[PDB]
Every structure is written in structure tokens, then in C-alpha cells.
Automatic annotation (TrEMBL), chains A, B, C, D, E, F, G, H, I, J, K, L:
Its EC number is 4.2.1.10. InterPro entries: DHquinase_II, DHquinase_II_CS, DHquinase_II_sf. Homododecamer. GO terms for biological process: amino acid biosynthetic process; aromatic amino acid family biosynthetic process; chorismate biosynthetic process; quinate catabolic process. GO terms for molecular function: 3-dehydroquinate dehydratase activity. This is 3-dehydroquinate dehydratase. It comes from Acidithiobacillus caldus (strain SM-1). PROSITE patterns: DEHYDROQUINASE_II (PS01029).
């Protein structure tokens, strides 16, 4: 019954902070992951993070989550938001509640970005708040408990 | 430069907790508003709340917000999410950043609910976390500062 | 357990009988309301009527209906048929059965009129029979009892 | 000038009351037809009823209606509501006013059911009131006279 | 190798000339059929005509056409133009060339009338010329020979 | 509790093997029906077959199936796949499980063929395997038992 | 027979000139209204102006216009352009000719802005000319007389 | 009151018979025009023909037709069928009845070809009969007289 | 810096006043052009007018406008409103501000007329005011200066 | 010329039987694969099975199939049914006939599931029969031989 | 068998280099045409160039190309890309292979620009490379030989 | 500042030349890659090539390109053209200009192929020229320098 959070980052999230740290932003996925680990450790929770450009790596992580003791998922599918029925179906199959996080406002970009294969089965959605969205996701899990 | 939050609740949100407190939920808008006031007072912020079934009352509140010193808006347009171009245009006109909050998962209901007149100009979106979404909205404003 | 009917008339229904009584029709909302009151009094029922050009006035009336003892609603949303998610959501929230009435044939007019925010949650639909539709609505409630 | 009503029932309406009389309903088409005959006889009217699974049988009945002295039609096209341009065109050709009746709420089912080949040329529409819709149709014809 | 024409008339074409001979037209299907027979007899051709309100009767006639020696079909599907995949598929299966005839302008009516299940496999299309369209169809067959 | 299969063939299936036995195929509906009868007799099952170009004949057969002791239906609606809401509704009303069979690949033809009024309520779908699809349907029923 | 103009301004038009008078514009609704009054007084006409964020206030003003002697309406529905069937239906019901005015180019903004519930029943349309559009509307009424 | 036919051929019709006379066809526009002239002279009619690749040349010819005494137009807009609102509007403006002729089956080609800017205002439509369509058009005009 | 207006009239505008001067209107393009010339001469402006049924003639006139000293364009594209990307692109390329004028209400006609290739790059739009729209266009240019 | 079947299972099919064996089903992919191997060995055929959550692994298996001697493919693309153009194009490129198998009824789920990138190039389709679909696929290959 | 290239430039391409040579570009159509002539002369080829704002001039040039000995066409339809079925049909009729060239990225502009009446019958497509696209087109023709 | 080209080939491009070298083509990816290397070496450029059936391998290559010194990308996404938002977003994130190359005409195939997730952010597009498209891409990069 210990809270165990899997944080899943989709493709290209490894690039956070690389190009034009001035214009685009200086926060790195490593910085985000360290901060989520602390916030989860602070609460007495397990947390592990995985980023992948590979759909199958994220699907494997979801498939393995139940036997690893995962209770909650925090997912930023990034590009896969609009494409990955495989990851949607892995989430539906293991039935672990997940919060969908987007750094940016997906409603203010190309029209195709407005469609999510996740939003109808998500247990919550946080967008447009940058990297703070992940910490708010953990806040959301905590505030339920 | 003091943080002043306007919390705006759209139509039917006054009914929270009224019918079948067992099945639907027992939390009341009054309880939500008291909790947001405390959380804002805790941080040294001003906060005022307004619920209305009337589009014009919400539009007036937005129009008046700038001269009242409002810095941030937390908005749950409820039904008006899908209908109120007037409220969208009042938000665009006064250019105060707002976070869009929905209690429920709007992606898991009637198809018409998936369209928001707010999501493309919102500074953040929090859905499907029940009444906790409002407190997370305040958390989001705080975490920026 | 006494039958209490709320009759709700949407915008512009106050104009019935005003302009070109020859071409358009001479029956007035006041005449309709008097006739529904008699037909309800005849059956030992309570009935009250409200017309409004204001969405919030109709929503308030629905919100207040349960504590007023209303058992059935007869609703002619008129223009709001195509626009008012707020009134739909107030009806869904209080869960009082309603019959949707239209004077005219909404299928024989502008294409946008064919969409109703009410027809999928209505307990019955009567259109194209003019003012007689309201009395048939009362007949429908009676014939269930 | 005597009122002569043709009541037309489309495919599958013969099955009313057959399967799971508890869950689905116990009223039979024969019971409906007997009740409409009485209500019409009560008013001094002619009434005849025809059910068919065959489009051509319903079309023939409409084509023959004028020379039989039919003044009004009450039509439940059932499945043909969404498919039968032939029956629509037979109704348009003989120009006898008809009331469209549906037992169920066609707006609360599969999306394809929301389209009617009849609603734009009907003289009235009654849905979602079960078998009472037919008697209300007769009430509607009477209330015009 | 003798030219044998099957003329097929769809539903409601039996009503030609019945109602308001002044406004709508006085020509009858019997008159059309007599005229086509003469024009075909004049040329040394076989011709037989069939009208039906029944899809299956028209489909049977097409299925039987090849063994009857039919070389050409003249088809006015009327309402079935927009609905009868069965008749389309019977025409495709027997591979007898057909000319599609419409009395009226199908492009100047309800939007649904603009779709034909026949026009993409027809060997010719004649519309909007009234009953003369059938005689022009025979002219078209002749002018090929 | 004896397995009784009704095999229903839609319009134009009587033409199998008639035209260009070389190009199109030489197997006849009579040959298919004889083979299904043997395969069902082999298993100790009842089986009866009906083909019709008439929608009402297929609907009648479904309506009558329950009192005849039918346990399973094998249906090739052919053209009616895309048109017959009446047959869909007869299948839904009698609630006998059916397997939908198509000889051809309906996804590789005209776009309109991709829509089935049957696929969402079918208990199985077999397409593109020619006449073998029917025998596989019987195999599917057997393999459940 | 004296020309009496009602000028109706929709939601948010009260904000003209408030925020960033440099970038957005310095002209105020009060300035526009004073200028229209002068131009109408100059011509010997009555003119009254009403702005409202409330749909029902604009609908009431239209409903009351005929008995007030209004001959012409100049309407800037602003956000209601895309939403208010109630105001459209009030204009249709009182049958006073109206000119639709937009300050901005509605065709050069969000796609949803291209739809007007007014343009098909307007007696004229003037867009993209800023506040001058209202004075041109009065010019248009004058130039007819 | 003498019948005067203008035959208008759209772009690329000058190429008839040029490339691969074997595969595509050997009939030339000059041959068609000579044949229509004879058939019109035979009947005591005036006929003139014009082909153009230029929209404005065809529009000018329509604009000039009334003062030239033209009573009927036979039009093959070819590519302009799908594009030329100018030619449609010239035909509507001069209100001379026209028959729309297509050599080919426009329903059996690219999807965009199924749309005609002419079919809803044409006095008749003849397609898929090759060059014979023009002579049938003259037959159609004659058969009206 | 002298105001030089090019007035461009699209196809069929030469026909104004020709057919049924009673029903359709008696004003001629020549009368409109004389009136615009006077109104421009009155203000000390240059004005030249060109009507053409030819897209290329209007495009040439726009291309030549800058070196001719044109400051403003008044354009009635008529049929080309819905078709001429070439004229749109010529206007965009020379970047002279234009006002789009339509005599009629394009929103109250065929659905295809609601689309303009001009409205999103126009500096103003005036419709439904008949020939007065052109003079209002000149008024609009003047009122800016 | 020996029959060699490649059975390809898409993402998440490894989870069969894992979660709630009571509600969802107890059959495992390992059980399915053992049964297909036996049924193929029984017939003297080669069969190999591969499941992958990785699109590239399935594409590689198809690319390699021809040189491995594969004659037939049985494919359950699962989530990739709706997404994998790469796998479709690998199947088209190697031109080995495949049968598409789905455990569930894809027509009775989310609307997006109704689209297959495989159904138009499949040599057969079997859906909604659970794990028996794979054995029926082998039956289908056998029944061709 | 000598390579003879026709280079066709659509409307507005004559304006290249005219307005704001700094921002938009300084290369002129005359410069492009001189460069293509040299590159073709270099290879021993014939080349002629034609620009026109007139659809009929481009169509005439295509119609005349075969008898002039043209082997290849390089076409920049510019605005006509989205509108000219006449030019498409002239290219299809003469069956000379053409390469479609666009200076700009048509996928990165207004949505309507994404549709080409040429791309499905082109022998190649080069976009977004500015004036270099034409020289690459010649390179493409050469590299085939 | 040395030109370094990354050539990326998507799924199934490894199969070039494998099956039916006569019908489909004999050129192999290895032959293409050798030719691009020579052409780049000829110009003093670096070039490396990567083909993958795996989306993540192509995304990794793009992510790594900037630190490897890549200046230009030549990309043939093949099937991923229509599916890979991940690869689009990797290209957008590293902001290296890319030319999109397709061997075939994507506009002349299945409708779904007409959509590219790349064309709106590409620096150029070359299609339908077979393997020569890649060499033209290098020509395009050179011709800019």
C-alpha cells in the first residue's frame, strides 16, 4: 500500500535545456527528475523516472509497473500523445491511474496537437505550466491522500 | 505587486454537494471557497471568489478585475466552457493570466465537451482532479513565485 | 407525491401573438399559460410557468425546482435549444424529468436548428404542433399516471 | 370531411411485448391498435392500422390512402426512419398530413438514429413517450379540431 | 443480337398524373410506357416495362434480364436512387448497360438527392427533362446503333 | 439446447457462379448451402438456409428464429450490409448471436462499403475468404462448444 | 415615419480605449455614441444607443424597439455574433432592418469567428473599418433615403 | 419566336480526336459542330457554336446571347464545370434555359468531378453518351416543341 | 501622396440594369462609375474604374496599380470572390489596401458563396447595400483621412 | 512449396490472461502459440510466432519472412492496427498473403478503432471470436489447400 | 527525340523582384528564364518559357506543345495550382510529362494552398527551394537521361 | 562551417531492389548511399547515411546531429511521413534545415498518404523522381552555396 510513482517522459523530453537556454528554457530533464525524486522521498514514497524516444520502452515500463508495485503513473507522452495507441492500451490493460502532463499548451499549437490518445482514460490532466506540471502531478496524488 | 487571485465559478457549480452526497460527492462550493481563501491568506495573497449562472456577471467580474488589482484568475467556466465567446473575449481584453480548472474529465463525456473557448488562451489547464484542481491552481500560481 | 409541473419558456416566446396576428398567429403566451394552469388545476396538480429571455433566470428556476416540490418540467428552450449547455447541465444536475416542446418544426428550418442540447436527456419530445404541444406535454405526464 | 386516420407501424413493431416482458415492456402492438381504434371510434372517426416489415407494403398503404378517404396519418417508421426515401416520397406525393411517432428517444441511441427522412415534412413529431405517443398523436389531431 | 430494352421504374412513379394534374403534370406512367413500346416497336426492338414500389421486384427483374435476352436497361430508380445498394449490385452483377433517367433535377432538391448509387456504373445519365428523358434514353441506345 | 443455425444470404447471392464462371468463380449458393448442411449434420446440429433479395423476408426469418429454436445465425447481408437498419434492429430485438460473413474484402472496394449496420452488434466477423467464410463461421460456433 | 435608429453594442465593447490606448486604440464607446448621436441629430433622426454584456438586455431592447418607434437597427453583436441565436430570433421576430457592424476583420482571426448568426438576415454588413463602421452604417441608412 | 441554339464548348474540347484516335476516339469538335448545324437547319432552327479555353469568351457569349435572339443553350463546360462561378452567374443573369452535356461519366472519375456549378440551374443534364449527348440535347429541345 | 482609387468590378457586373429593370434593379454600372468619379473628383482624388469578365484583366490592373500611383482599391470580385486565388495573390503582392464590396448579401444565397478568397486580406468589407456599397467604400477611405 | 505460417502478435498481446483472469479471460499468449504450433505441426506445416511491443521488430520479421520461406502470415496488429503504416508497407512490399485477426470486436469500441491500415490489403479478416480467431485463420489457410 | 522543355509560369510570377527586393527577394522572372535557357542550351536542349496571368494562354501553350516538339514541361501554376482544372486537363490530354515547381512551401501557408490540381498527375514535384527549383527541375529531366 | 549532410531513410527503404527487380526497380539503398557519399565527397562535404525501421533510431540520429556537426538533413521518412510526430518534433527541436524526399508520388496513392508531418517544417520537398530525388536534394543544398 506504499505510494510508488512511475514518471514516464516521452520522446524529445531529453532535449530540455539543450538549445538556446535563454529563449526556450534552461531546466533539464535531469533537474526535473531530481526534484520529483526529492518531493517523493519527502513524502515517504517510491518514485522512478524513465524517458525514452522508443514507444516500446514506455509500453514495457507500463506493462512491468504492476509487479514492480507502482500505484500511480505521471505521464508526459510528448509526441506520442497524438500517435501511441500502444501506450494508451498498455495503460488501460494495467489499470494504474495516471495523470497526463504537458509542458506546453497543446491547444495553442498545430491543430493535430489538440487530440490526445490519453485524455479520455487519464485520472487527471495538467498542461501549460512547464516543468512545474510534474510537481503539481505529485501534489495531486498527495492531495488525494 | 501583491498577488490577488479572482476565482470564477460558472453555472451549476453552486449545486456541488446538494443531490445524492453519497454517489456524486459531499464537497460544497462554500467549502471549496473557504479552503481557497485560507490557502491564499496563508501565502499573504488577496483572493476573492464569485460563482454565477449568468455569463454577464462573470464577464463584468473579469472587466473589473484589472482596476481591482487582480494579478491571476482561476476559472471554472463549467457549461460556459463550450459556449461563452463573451467571457473568452473579456479574458483576452484584460490580459490577466488565468488557469482553466474542470472538476471532471471533459474528454470522457459527450463529444461537444471536448471543445473549450478557453484552452488556447489559458496560462494553464487542470482537469479531472475534482475540487483539488482549484487548490492545485493556487499551487501553480505560487510555484511560479 | 403531488404532481407539480414547472413550465419554462425560453427567449422570444413572450412575443407570441404580437406581430401580424393574421399571418403568424394570434395565441399569446398569457393565453397558453392560463390554459395550462386550468388543465393542471383540473387534474389536482400544481403548475407554475416562467418565461425569460435570460439563460440564468431559467437555470435558477431549474436549480430551485427540487426544493419547490417540482415533479415534472415542460420546457420550450426556444433559441436556447441550440446554445444553452448551462440549462442542459442544470436539468441533468436536478434530474427532474422534462418534456421538450417546440411550437415549430425545427427540422424544416435553418440546418443549425436540427441540433438540440436537450433531446438526448429529455423524457419526451413534442414538436411542430404549435401551442397545443404544451397541453399534449401535460397529457403525456397525465397518461403516465 | 369525416376524420379518417391511417396508423402505420414500421418493421419490428410486431415484436412489442415478445421478449423479456419484465425488462423491455409487456404492451403489444395488438393492444396499442385496439386502444387507438377505441379512441378514434369514441370521437366518431375512422381509423385503420397496418404494420409491415416491408417498405413496399407501407408505401402502397400511403399511395392508396387518398382514395380510401384518409385525412391524417400517424406513422412510426421505426428502422425505416433512417433509410426509406420511398416512404418519404409517397407521403410527399399524396400530401396527407402525418405525425411522426417514435416509442424511444432516437437522440439518445446510435448517432445514425438522429437522422429522419420524415421530420422535415412531418406535421408533428412525438418521441420518447413509449406507446402513449400514438394516443397523443390522436389527441394532437383532435386538438386541431 | 436483337435489341431488347427493359424499362424499370422505381417507387411512386405509378402516381404520375394522379394528384393536381394542372400543377404537377397530367402524363401517366401508362402513357409513358405505351409511348416507349411504340418507339421500340418502330425500331424493330423488344421492350418490356416494370414499375414497382418493391426493391426486390426490381432486383429480380434485373437478375432475370440476361436469360430473357435483355441487351439494354433504362432505369429510373426514383427514391431507390439514394438507397438501393441491392439494385446497384444486381446491375453490376449482370453487366447489362443501363441509362439512368430522372424526371426532375435531383441537383436542385434536398442535398441528400445529389448522391446516386447508380451514376458511377451507368452507361449514361439523363435528368430534368420530365417523361421525355425515357424517349431520349431510347434515342441514345438507337444512336449507338 | 441443440445447436440450430440459421444461415441468411442477402440480395444477389443467388447469382453466385452464374456469369463468367472462369473469371468470377464457379461455386453456387446451392453448393454452399449443401456443404453447410453436411457440416452441421456431421456435428449433430440443425441448420436451415434462406436467401432473399427482399429485406422483409430476411427480417421475418430473424423474427421467427427464436420460436423455431434457432441458437446461432450466420448472416451475409450482402448489399443490405450498408442499408438495412430493419434487419439490424430485428437481430438486436431477438438477441440471437450472429456471425457476419462477407465473401469479398469490403475494405478494398467503394468507400461506402466500409460501413456495416451489423459489425458493432455481431458476435464475430469473417470477410475476404470467399465461400469458405460460411464454413469457418460454423467452425467458429463449434469451437465455442 | 421619422427615422429612429437603435445602436446596439455587444459584450466587451465598453472596454474600447481602456487598455494600451497606444497599441490597441484610444477611441471609447462613449466617443462613438456621442458621434453617432450628433450625426443622427444632424439628419433630424432619433437615435438611442445601448451596450450590454448581457444577451437578455440586448434581446429586451430589440423586443421593445417596434413600440418605441425604432425604424433601423445598427448592431455590433461582438462575441454574441458567434453564439446568440436568441438575439438573431428577436431581430427576425420584430422584422426591423439591421446593419451588422464589426470593428475588426472577423475573417482574419480564429476560424470560429467566420460564422455569424446575423449575416444571413442582416440588411447590410460593414466590417474591418474600426469605429468608422458605425458612422458608415448611418450613412448607409441615409443613402437609402 | 424562332428557336436559336447557342452550343458552348469549354476548354480542351478542341482536342477531341487529336491524340490516339484508336484508343480515345476519332470524332472531332468540327465534326460534332457540323452535325449539330445540320440537325438544327433540318428543324428550321438557328444554331451557332463556340469553343474556348477562355472563361471570359464563354461568359461574353452568354451575356450577348439574349440580344442575338438565342432561345436555348447547350453547354459542355468541361473543366469549367467544377470551377466557373462566372459562367454559372452569366447563365443565371440572362435566364436562357440550358442543357448541361458531358461526354464522359463525371461520376466515375476523380471525386472533385462530381461537383457541378451548373447542375442545380440546368434545364436538363445528359452525360456519359459521348458526342451523341449534344444531338440528344437538340432532340430534348425539339421534343419540348 | 494624392489619393488615387482603382475601382475593380468582376464578371457580370456589366449586366447591371439590363434584364427586368422593374424586378432586379435599373442602376447600371455606367451610372455607378459616373457617381464614383464625381464623388472622388469632389474630394480632389484620382479614380479609375475597370470592369472585366476576364480574371487576367483584373490581375493585370492590380499588378499595374502601384506604378500608376494607386493608393486604395475598391473591389467587387463578383463570381471571382469564390474562385480567384490569382487576383487574391496579385492584391497580396502589391500590398495596396482594398475594400471588398458585394451588392448582395452573399450569406443569404448558395452555401458556396459564403467563402471569399478576399475577406481575410481586405482592409474592409461592405455587403448587401446594393450599388451604395461602392460610395460607402469611398466614404470609408475618406473617413480614414 | 511447404506451407510456412508466421504468426505476428502486436503490442500488449503478451498481457493476455495476466489481470483479472475471471473477468477479462485466462488464456495466455503462450497457450495460443502452443495450440497454433500443434495445429500447424498436425498439418505438416512450419509455423513460427513472434509477439513484440516494438513496431520495428514486427516490420523486421515481415521483411525477413520471404527468405525464411514464409508462405502465409497471420497478423494481430493490436494497437498498431490503427497506427502502423510501416508494418502495412512491409506487408505490401513482401507480398505474402496475410489474414488480419482481432480478438475483440473493433467496431464496438472507440470510433478510432474502426480504421485499420491492414484491412484493404488483407487476404482475410477474422474479428470478435477471441483467441479462436487465430486457429480459424489457420483453418482458412488450410481450406484454401 | 531532341529534349525540348516548355517552362510555364502562372499568374503573378512576373512580379518576382519588384516590391521590397531586400525583404521578399531580388531575382526576377527574366533572370530565371535566362538561366534556364543557358542550362538547357548547355545540354543541347531546346527550351522556351511563357508566363501568363491568363489560364487560357497557359492551356493554349500546353495544347500546342506536342506539335511544337515539346518532350518535357516544367510548370509553376502559382495561384492556378489550387483552381485550374482546365490546365490539369490540358496536361492530361497531351500526356507530356511535367515537373510541378513551387518557389515557396505551399504546406506552410493558408490551408487551401495544400491542395494541388497537378500533384497527382505530375512526374515530379519540387517546392520550397525558391527559383533554384526550376534549375533542379532541369537537373531532374537531365538525370533521367 | 563545413557542410555535413545526414541522410535519413525510413522504414522499408532497405528493401529497395529486392523483390521483382524488373517491375519495381533494381537500384538498392546501398547503391543510393554510395552515390550520395561520392557526390558529397566530390564537393568537400561530410555525409553520413542511416536507414532504420525504428522511429527511435531516426529520432536519436536527429537529436545527436547538432553535436556531430550536421548542417543539413536529407530525410525520406517513408511510412513515418504519415505517422511520426516524434521525428517531426526532433527536427523542430534541433532546428537543422531538412529537405523531405519521397521516391514515389505520394499524391497519386491512398488518400492517407497526402498528409505529411514534415512538409510544413521542411526547407524543401522533392517527390516522384525515384532515387534521383536524393541527389537532387544534395544539388539543392549545393545550389544554396
Amino acid at each position: 500500500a506504499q505510494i510508488h510513482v512511475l514518471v514516464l517522459h516521452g520522446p524529445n523530453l531529453n532535449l530540455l535545456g539543450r538549445r538556446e537556454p535563454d529563449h526556450y528554457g534552461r531546466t533539464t530533464l535531469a533537474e526535473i527528475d531530481a526534484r520529483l525524486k526529492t518531493e517523493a522521498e519527502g513524502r515517504g514514497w517510491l518514485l522512478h523516472s524513465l524517458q525514452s524516444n522508443a514507444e516500446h520502452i514506455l509500453v514495457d515500463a507500463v506493462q512491468q509497473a504492476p509487479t514492480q508495485g507502482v500505484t500511480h503513473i505521471v505521464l508526459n507522452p510528448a509526441a506520442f500523445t497524438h500517435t501511441s495507441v500502444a501506450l494508451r492500451d498498455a495503460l488501460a490493460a494495467v489499470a494504474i491511474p495516471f495523470i497526463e502532463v504537458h509542458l506546453s499548451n497543446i491547444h495553442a499549437r498545430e491543430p493535430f496537437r489538440r487530440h490526445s490518445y490519453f485524455s479520455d482514460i487519464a485520472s487527471g490532466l495538467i498542461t501549460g505550466l512547464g516543468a512545474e506540471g510534474y510537481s503539481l502531478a505529485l501534489d495531486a496524488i498527495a492531495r488525494r491522500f
